[PDB]
Amino acid sequence: SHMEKETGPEVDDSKVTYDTIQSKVLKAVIDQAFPRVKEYSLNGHTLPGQVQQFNQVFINNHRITPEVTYKKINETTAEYLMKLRDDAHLINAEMTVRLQVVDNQLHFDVTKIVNHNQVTPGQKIDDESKLLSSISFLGNALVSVSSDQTGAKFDGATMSNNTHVSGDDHIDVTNPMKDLAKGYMYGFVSTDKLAAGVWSNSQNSYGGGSNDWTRLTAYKETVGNANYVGIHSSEWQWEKAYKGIVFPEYTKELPSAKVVITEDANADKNVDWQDGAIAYRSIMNNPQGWEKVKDITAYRIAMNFGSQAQNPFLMTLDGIKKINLHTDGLGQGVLLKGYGSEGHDSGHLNYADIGKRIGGVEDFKTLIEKAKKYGAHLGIHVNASETYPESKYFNEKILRKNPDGSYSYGWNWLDQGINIDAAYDLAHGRLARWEDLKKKLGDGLDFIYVDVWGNGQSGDNGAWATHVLAKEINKQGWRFAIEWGHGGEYDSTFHHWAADLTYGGYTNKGINSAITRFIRNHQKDAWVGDYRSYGGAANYPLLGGYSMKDFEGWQGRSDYNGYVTNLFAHDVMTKYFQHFTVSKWENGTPVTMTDNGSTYKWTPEMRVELVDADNNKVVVTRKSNDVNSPQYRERTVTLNGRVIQDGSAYLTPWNWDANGKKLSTDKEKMYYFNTQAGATTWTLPSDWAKSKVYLYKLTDQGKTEEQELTVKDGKITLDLLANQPYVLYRSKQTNPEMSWSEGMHIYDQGFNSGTLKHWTISGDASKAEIVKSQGANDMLRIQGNKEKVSLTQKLTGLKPNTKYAVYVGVDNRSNAKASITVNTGEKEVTTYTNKSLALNYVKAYAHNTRRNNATVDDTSYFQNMYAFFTTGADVSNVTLTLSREAGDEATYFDEIRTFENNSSMYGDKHDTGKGTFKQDFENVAQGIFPFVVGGVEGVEDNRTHLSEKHDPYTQRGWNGKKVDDVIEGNWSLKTNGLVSRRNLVYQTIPQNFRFEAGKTYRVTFEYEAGSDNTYAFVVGKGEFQSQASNLEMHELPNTWTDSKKAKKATFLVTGAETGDTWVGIYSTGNASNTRGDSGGNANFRGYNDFMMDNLQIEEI
């Protein structure tokens, strides 16, 4: 009141004809001349709409006075025909606005739009001003509040992803007050009697950051002696075009907005934004798939990359079973990053190209269907921003070009990507790409994760473009997910950088807004989770917040144990709260924090209450407001006044199956988890109190160590291991049959079942054990055997007369022969290894040589050992045998994968056998056989993979490309950019191809090399060391300056008597020659690359 009171034009609506539309509880007085609400009335209390007439709209940004005719449709409903004509700006249109009261809601709908100009979605338009592209009712508040009203206040949320900075504004409406003209995602006005919330489908943006997702605009308007704060819908979009081409019809969404009016809705006897937020759930858009979120407790990524097939579709079902047992049936969400093409960041845009080397559409369909019973939902990683020449959808027309006409290059890794123009893509059939995937896959896939979208790589990725993209995905029945905490606010249900707490640091997490989280906490994982070092909202949020970890290869992640502990430490309780809707949010006093380079104030939530449809009430209370107290980072949680979490421990009722379905009373359970040692005591519900109670320790074998608990006056006391999940039931439970590895033709391919029962052991069974790697990955170990030990299992469900490959991962520390043998009943084939000599450098593979997932002695020499065979007519007697001849030291085996394969490598025949060896790379089972990737990049998503032909884009000449990606057929072996490394790129190993002692072989291949002597053919023996081991080097010349195609290389190689000779490709110390090119041009054109094809090795 110390600044000058403000004054404005008075209201004069003495000549206005008003009508009333009303439900039983809500009356709205409306102008017949224009769709303006003068005032809302509910239970004798009022809120203004737009008090000052503004009978104008903005059409394509032009102020227009519409010619309006009114009709009263019925007691609740009025229509306004609004003719829009301005010849000078080529506006000749009409729209109908319907105002309708439904219970305590007012609906504002543009129900019908007619553009009299000729516009046809999909066709060229000569003049964009002919489009009816935007409709704005800015200037007409849908609801407001006046400074003359007691308790007048506005609350609004904007996007903030910085954990120190709340996105919310709380503004008292006073005269005087600060100017206000600002976009909001959510907005409320209230008095001490009524609160109103406003929703709009407007995909307006005023800019990036807090200016985005601004579907509402709040404005201060001084009317007479009073200030009003009014909430307006932001501008709506309609007919739009790109470079003259009108977008498809589905991009037009009819404008809609809603207001909801409420008294006290949480029984705290105060009326404020929280009541408005509760009521707002009845008018708001709901991101499709949101209902599922609360029961997706175990999210993770399973990764494939670079043709390696690290995680075949049917293998992922075994990880789902492991997590099912270990969590006693918590729901799951597995994002398949690398589901398509050759893996992650291969083949982008071709969404329907399901990865062949991981089992194709047939195994993907099986994974989806069979995962349902475990409440496991599958998602896929796609890209709508960048592609590669290999992709069916790579074309000049789709590529993004800079103003100077150069390509907007993407990242160079396996291949040099080029960004696409997403607006062009939308305007030229993007939708059909999703349709093709949906048709091929059928029903059942849960979610689409669109990587990078939001970062502008493909041009406009803002609110409008994101809603269009999400609608294409939702239309196929899929749920939307994206990378950034700030992305997809309207439609996303999952944000990777909100959920993986380690990413981005404190400025780039989930949505830091009490208002937004209150409204939608239960609908998405988009929030600030607990990560103390970020401070602010991340310093122990009372609602928790998803914490994602992984164990299936994503960024080299393999920590299964840590994954499960994390689920219990953060996610069980986070997900518990998502089964309820927030009803009350109470802040404590501001505290001072110091972290991330500043001292700042933060106002922490001290209590949050939640409720469900059955009026269960959950109360979550922070144990101290003192930021220096250990109790600041602790909560008490009650359900109906019963303590279920207190500090370090919880004993939490879980009444839902893996898919969220309510459990029968007798299947109800409770989870216990305590991050500290110590006895804890819990009050049970009376219907548990008079029952026997049974406790189980949860492990990767499911429920173990059954104990009957002693109940005393309805209490139990639990004194158990810290950081260890348990589950409690009212009756004795059993572990069901998991059918490990169903569809993979063998039982329990990964040694997860805790026994070798399905194997027939010939020899001393005490010498064969399932043991844990340094990464807790179970493996078969055979050691210390004086006689042969063999393990045999039938291969089941094979097709007759069909060609197959089978491999087992093998790491042999013994010199003794370790073998895989298949007997089809007509033929026996066998492959073996003596001591393993090649470390494993595949980052997304579970048994790479990184120390934390090493086999033993801090190393892993795991490599896939293959046999190739063909079934005959009878498939009832096909056996696989793993054996180890006598030796002291250990052989490790894991992951037996049998799958169709059509290679013809052995004297032009499929089956393992003698004859000239040939690799044309046209029928590779997986990886780069007979080579394995070397240590040139250490453990990495290796820059060598099988290159796929897409003429002319992948071949010499396209954008000045010097060398072909593919030499002959559809596939070659490509190494991208690994020049000047002085290290081994890849090598054969004896189990893949053996240079027999004292025999001599001719090794021939065709190759492309972009520069002279950057790569060399090498001959070695034993384990490579970069004392550098001895190598016979053959530097290779470039293949383009004096040749129109790949050159031929040929070498004589004699096998060392020790049997451990191999050959490969080595990155020399020589600098490449990029012929004056730099940047993306030099990367694209292949100066730094090496391609091989048509390998042949024959004895001479």
Q: How far is the CB of 195 from Ca ion (least distance, A)?
A: 8
Helix axes 360-371, 313-327, angle to 10 degrees: 10
Question: Residue positions in the annotated binding site for substrate?
Answer: 345
Q: How far is the CB of 265 from Ca ion (least distance, A)?
A: 6
The three-class DSSP label of residue 556 is: helix
Q: How far is the CB of 1088 from Mn ion (least distance, A)?
A: 15
Q: Which is nearer to Mn ion, 239 or 390 (CB)?
A: 390
Peptide bond into 930 cis (omega under 30): yes
Residue 266 interacts with, from Ca ion, Mn ion, none (CB under 5-8 Å by kind): Ca ion
Q: How far is the CB of 864 from Mn ion (least distance, A)?
A: 21
DSSP 765-796: GGGEEEEE-TTS-EEEEE-SBSS-EEEEEEPP
Residue 1012 interacts with, from Mn ion, Ca ion, none (CB under 5-8 Å by kind): none
Residue 378 interacts with, from Mn ion, Ca ion, none (CB under 5-8 Å by kind): none
Q: How far apart are the two ends of the chain, measured CA to CA in Å?
A: 101
Q: How many CA atoms lie within 13 A of 908 on its CB side?
A: 0
Q: What is the dihedral of CA 477, 479, 483, 486, to 10 degrees?
A: 120
Q: How far is the CB of 946 from Mn ion (least distance, A)?
A: 7
Q: Which is nearer to Ca ion, 612 or 968 (CB)?
A: 968
Residue 268 interacts with, from Ca ion, Mn ion, none (CB under 5-8 Å by kind): Ca ion
Are the C-beta atoms of 802 and 870 separated by less than 8 Å? yes
Look at strands 332-337 and 298-303 and give their pairing.
Answer: parallel
DSSP 160-212: ---TTS--EEEEE--SS----EEEESEEEEE-SS-EEEEEE-----SSSGGGS
Residue 777 interacts with, from Mn ion, Ca ion, none (CB under 5-8 Å by kind): Ca ion
Question: Residue positions in the annotated binding site for Ca(2+)?
Answer: 264, 266, 268, 270, 275, 920, 922, 968, 971, 1093
The three-class DSSP label of residue 466 is: helix
Which region, judged by CB under 5 A, interacts with Mn ion, from 199-207, 273-281, 384-392, 929-937?
A: 384-392
Q: What is the dihedral of CA 458, 461, 467, 472, to 10 degrees?
A: 10
Q: Figure out which of the listed residues 415, 451, 778, 911 binds Mn ion, where binding follows CB under 5 A.
A: 415
Q: How far is the CB of 440 from Mn ion (least distance, A)?
A: 21
Q: Cα 28 to chain center, whole Å?
A: 45
Closest CA to 1063 of 918, 905, 934: 934
Site string for Mn ion, 946-965 (x = CB under 5 A): -x------------------
Q: Which is nearer to Mn ion, 347 or 556 (CB)?
A: 347
**From 221, 363, 451, 489, the catalytic residue:** 451
Q: Which is nearer to Mn ion, 86 or 922 (CB)?
A: 922
Per CB under 5 A, does 525 bind Mn ion? Answer: no
Give the nearest residue (CB) to Mn ion.
415
Are the C-beta atoms of 35 and 73 separated by less than 8 Å? no
Tell me phi and psi for residue 758, to 5 degrees: -75, -15
Q: Which is nearer to Mn ion, 343 or 990 (CB)?
A: 343
Cα–Cα distance, 237 to 903 (Å, whole number): 55
Catalytic residue flag (residue 948): no
Are the C-beta atoms of 349 and 387 separated by less than 8 Å? yes
Structure tokens at 217: 């605009």
Name the β-bridge partners of 134. 237
Residue 415 interacts with, from Ca ion, Mn ion, none (CB under 5-8 Å by kind): Mn ion
Residue 1065 interacts with, from Ca ion, Mn ion, none (CB under 5-8 Å by kind): none
Q: Which is nearer to Ca ion, 827 or 1047 (CB)?
A: 1047
Are the C-beta atoms of 684 and 691 separated by less than 8 Å? no
Q: How far is the CB of 390 from Mn ion (least distance, A)?
A: 5
Helix axes 463-475, 430-441, angle to 10 degrees: 30
Which region, judged by CB under 5 A, interacts with Mn ion, from 385-393, 565-573, 734-742, 1087-1095?
A: 385-393
Tell me phi and psi for residue 229, to 5 degrees: -110, 120
Long-range contacts of 111-118 (CB under 8 A, 24+ apart): 111/79, 111/254, 113/238, 113/254, 115/239, 116/92, 117/90, 117/92, 117/93
Q: Rule CB under 5 A: which of 390-409 touch Mn ion? A: 390
Q: Which is nearer to Mn ion, 235 or 390 (CB)?
A: 390
Residue 304 interacts with, from Mn ion, Ca ion, none (CB under 5-8 Å by kind): none
Name the β-bridge partners of 246. 241
Specify burial of residue 127 (Cβ count, 10 A radius: 0-12, 13-18, 19+). Answer: exposed
Q: Which is nearer to Ca ion, 944 or 1081 (CB)?
A: 944
Which region, judged by CB under 5 A, interacts with Mn ion, from 377-385, 649-657, 764-772, 944-952?
A: 944-952
Q: How far is the CB of 948 from Mn ion (least distance, A)?
A: 6
Compute the radius of gyration of the chain from its Cα atoms.
33
Catalytic residue flag (residue 483): yes
Please name the residues in contact with 611: beta carbons below 8 A apart, sequence gap of 6 or more: 580, 581, 583, 617, 618
Q: Rule CB under 5 A: which of 604-623 touch Mn ion? A: none
Q: How far is the CB of 805 from Mn ion (least distance, A)?
A: 22
Residue 345 interacts with, from Mn ion, Ca ion, none (CB under 5-8 Å by kind): none
Residue ranges binding Ca ion (CB under 5 A)? 1-2, 264, 266, 268, 270, 275, 750-751, 777-778, 894, 920-921, 968-969, 971, 1093
Q: Which is nearer to Ca ion, 627 or 768 (CB)?
A: 768
Q: Which is nearer to Mn ion, 669 or 943 (CB)?
A: 943
Cα–Cα distance, 364 to 366 (Å, whole number): 5
Closest CA to 491 of 471, 513, 465: 471
Q: How far is the CB of 480 from Ca ion (least distance, A)?
A: 32
Task: Give the interface size with Mn ion as a residue count (CB under 5 A).
Answer: 4
Using CA atoms, how far residue 226 sits from 12, 51, 192, in Å, is 15, 11, 17
Cα–Cα distance, 457 to 448 (Å, whole number): 19
Residue 969 interacts with, from Ca ion, Mn ion, none (CB under 5-8 Å by kind): Ca ion
Are the C-beta atoms of 694 and 708 separated by less than 8 Å? yes
Specify burial of residue 710 (Cβ count, 10 A radius: 0-12, 13-18, 19+). Answer: exposed
Which region, judged by CB under 5 A, interacts with Mn ion, from 415-423, 583-591, 645-653, 887-895?
A: 415-423
Q: Which is nearer to Mn ion, 850 or 950 (CB)?
A: 950
**From 212, 483, 500, 525, the catalytic residue:** 483
Residue 814 interacts with, from Ca ion, Mn ion, none (CB under 5-8 Å by kind): none
Q: How far is the CB of 827 from Ca ion (least distance, A)?
A: 28
Look at strands 376-383 and 447-451 and give their pairing.
Answer: parallel
User: Which residues make up the interface to Mn ion (CB under 5 A)?
Assistant: 390, 414-415, 947
The set of catalytic residues is: 451, 483
